[PDB]
Amino acid sequence: NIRPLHDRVIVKRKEETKSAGGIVLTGSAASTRGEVLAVGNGRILENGEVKPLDVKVGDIVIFNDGYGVKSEKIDNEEVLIMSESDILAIVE
Amino acid sequence: NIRPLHDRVIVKRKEETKSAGGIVLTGSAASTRGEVLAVGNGRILENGEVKPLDVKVGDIVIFNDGYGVKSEKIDNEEVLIMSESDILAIVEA
Amino acid sequence: NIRPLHDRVIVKRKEETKSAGGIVLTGSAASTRGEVLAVGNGRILENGEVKPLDVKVGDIVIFNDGYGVKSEKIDNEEVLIMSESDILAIVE
Amino acid sequence: QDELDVVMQFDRGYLSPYFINKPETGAVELESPFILLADKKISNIREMLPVLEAVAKAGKPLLIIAEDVEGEALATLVVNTMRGIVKVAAVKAPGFGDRRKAMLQDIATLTGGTVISEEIGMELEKATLEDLGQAKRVVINKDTTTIIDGVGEEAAIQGRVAQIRQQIEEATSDYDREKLQ
Amino acid sequence: QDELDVVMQFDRGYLSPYFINKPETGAVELESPFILLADKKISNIREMLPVLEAVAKAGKPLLIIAEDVEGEALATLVVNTMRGIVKVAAVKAPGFGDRRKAMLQDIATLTGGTVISEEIGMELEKATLEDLGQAKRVVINKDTTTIIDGVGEEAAIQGRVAQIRQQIEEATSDYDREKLQ
DSSP states (O other), X not given: OEEEOSSOEEEEEOOOOSOTTSXXXXXXXXXXXXXXXXXXXXXXOTTSOXXXXXXXXXXXXXXXXXXXXXXXXXXXXXXXXXXXXXXEEEEO | OEEEOSSOEEEEEOOOOSOTTSOOOOTTTOOOEEEEEXXXXXXXXXXXXXXXXXXXXXXXXEEOOOSSXXXXXXXXXXXXXXXXXXXXXXXXX | OOOXXXXXXXXXXXXXXXXXXXXXXXXXXXOOEEEEEEEOOEEEOTTSOEEEOSOOTTOXXXXXXXXXXXXXXXXXXXXXXXXXXXXXXXXX | OOOOOOOOEESOOBSOGGGOSBTTTTEEEEESOEEEEESSOBOOGGGTHHHHHHXXXXXXXXXEEESOBOHHHHHHHHHHHHHTSOOEEEEOOSSSTHHHHHHHHHHHHHHTOOEEOSTTSOOSTTOOGGGOXXXXXXXXXXXXXXXXXXXXXXXXXXXXXXXHHHHTTSXXXXXXXXXXX | OOOOOOOOXXXXXXXXXXXXXXXXXXXXXXXSOEEEEESSOBOOGGGTHHHHHHHHTTOOOEEEEESOBOHHHHHHHHHHHHXXXXXXXXXXXXXXXXXXXXXXXXXXXXXXXXXXXXXXXXXXXXXXXXXXXXXXXXXXXXXXXXXXXXXXXXXXXXXXXXXXXXXXXSOOSHHHHHHHX
């Protein structure tokens, strides 16, 4: 398995082709959710302290697919590596 | 329900249809208001401290619909996720 | 051997040539993994302290091939010099 | 030998040739469908979702007679009937300018639907099954669209007719008389 | 002297001469393959990966009949059959303009595949083995491509034919009649 450095979350995206009704959307209209697989220790602060992350390994998280989101190939699985800054929420 | 991370406010947009006089405005003339549904703990500062948000769950808030505002689909409801930076004001009483 | 300054990691890239399936991609499509060869002391903080790096010499690391990644020629080997900021993970 | 064919119809074909549900005639035969009357021209599938939803959970097919059905919102509609999620047709509106809105309104009266006019304070999203017309059958080919026997009440119809009948009275120009009758 | 020859085929050769799997004839003989019908022209191997993947784990070869197979996405396809990872052929689409999409559709019906038309809301990546046609055998040389005995059901075929049969009825020009029959 992979290791995250400093503050990085490793996530795998999910899904959907359809909408609210099952009405299939076109690839102008139609993902921002994913599952946490590995988490870094935390950010290192100017005072030397290491702030832990508020995302545990195995949350369903809503993230911003920004510039800082990078893509990787792991065991032939599509994964994403982003900083915790790019995570917006959790689904509990 | 959803959870907000760090400093994020989850809001739902609204719309009045009428003006100063009751003269109904067209959907070219009339949105930047919304209601708070969930709030994050706060921003984390360089000194490690966690600053709480000044928006409580259930305020009517005026926000800037900037770049940092993202859209989500929740129970089939149109909701918005933005940082507290993007909130400008509260409508009280 | 080479020396790294402040916070710099010296890495050598590997290959992947293949994709999701083993379908070999053309050198328009195709690597982000590498091996650590040398590491700097650390970043210097406003209080004068020197924060060590969390990457030891000889890790297999996943990095972002950003703007801050520079190229060098060492014993006729293709090597890279990047800051630790550009390292995202370790493969253990 | 000589031959007579008989049918409301107007000069507009399907916008999407991938809708023909009977390749025998090379035409779309929508059985007992709903009818959406959009004054504005459609380009995004967002606007459709609310109404498309209620038609998808109603079983009945749907004809969409708007100013135009643009690619982004057309593309989708195709793959939806392509698969059998909803059965939908798309055809341009009969006419040009003020005559189009006038004719588009005629269809609403024959079918018991509401013209979803963007100009007079209606969004296409805020339409429901309420605002859709209905007909006994619909037939559309490369050139013409035909609505056979609409649900609209004959009171509203003959009221709408005796109105257009007196529009031809005040027609001081021959051309204004042609298109009215 | 006079001469009689017996045979669906169209005037297009392989795009990649490095595909010929039988240098005897100087032609590619794909045994019982899948068939990908791409309306748009292909330049990136990204789009292919999803479908190419499912064909690589199916064992059967694949014919790719798109508007064109550009270098970046061609280059790769070659080295993949070069090695034996997948067995793939690339040939341009028969025709030009609206006739191409029409003819490309004919092939889908004979083979039981779906035309992956970018215009009507389909991405090439969202295709699966589902949307691929199939044939008993395929033969392609420098000049012509031949699909021998496609999987498509004769219901759908003769339906598609009685449609094109009535397209020749409304042909008011001789040229519109030629290419249809």
